[PDB]
Amino acid sequence: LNLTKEQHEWLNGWLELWGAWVYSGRLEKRMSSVIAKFMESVEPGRVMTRPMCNDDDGMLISQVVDSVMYIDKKAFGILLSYYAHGSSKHAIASYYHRVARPMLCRGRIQKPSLATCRREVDEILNASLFMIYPVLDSAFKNRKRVEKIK
Ligand SMILES: [Cl-]
Numbered sequence: 428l429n430l431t432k433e434q435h436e437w438l439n440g441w442l443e444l445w446g447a448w449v450y451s452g453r454l455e456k457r458m459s460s461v462i463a464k465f466m467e468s469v470e471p472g473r474v475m476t477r478p479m480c481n482d483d484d485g486m487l488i489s490q491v492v493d494s495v496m497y498i499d500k501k502a503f504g505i506l507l508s509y510y511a512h513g514s515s516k517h518a519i520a521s522y523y524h525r526v527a528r529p530m531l532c533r534g535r536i537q538k539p540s541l542a543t544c545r546r547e548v549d550e551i552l553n554a555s556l557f558m559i560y561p562v563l564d565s566a567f568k569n570r571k572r573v574e575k576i577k
Contacts, residue, residue, distance in 0.1 A: 430557055438560050445488040446510030447479035454485065459493040461500055465507045477513070487570065491563045496555060501530050505548065506555050516552070520545035 430438070448454070449462060450473070456463035480488070496503040508514045514522075523532040524544040531551070532544035 428557070429553070430560055434560055435556060438556050438563065441480070441484075441488060441563065442492075442506075442510045442556070442559075444478060444480040445485055445492070446507070446513070447475065447477040448485040449489065449507070450511045450513070451475050451479060453479075453482060454489050458486075458489055459497070461497060461503050462489070462493065462507065462511075465504060465511065469512050487566055488563065491566050492559060495559050495562050499555075502551050502555050505531075505551050509552060516545060516548050520548045523548070 449466070450469075452466070454462060456466075479485070492503075492506070496506060505519060508519050509516065520532070520541060521544075524539065524541050526532075532539055532547055535543065537543075
């Protein structure tokens, strides 16, 4: 199946705010080893420019995303490259297309090109969002309920 237009737009905005929040260093490293190792692989010093969520929402989204994506560490890395580091899908595709194959974009009768790799990157991100959406929606709805109690 696939998410609807409004569901994708809703989730993408939250993940943009979360990615900016994570990239600023506001997520403590022990919460997610995958996210911790990722932030160690990005050039330091970069300044904040995009808007970010508050610490509560950031923690909630981090817990949801980690609980869903920790099994597919490569998809998790691509999600983080896109949302946290801010790399374009084009840049991610070009990267994985011009590497030394030490998983993604291996190559189908035709030789692997930038177009096929971009397609794979798009599909990985779409599948990730599809898996994340129900968990995040439930987490947000659950917090609201619990927050109302007394
Ligand atoms: Cl920390």
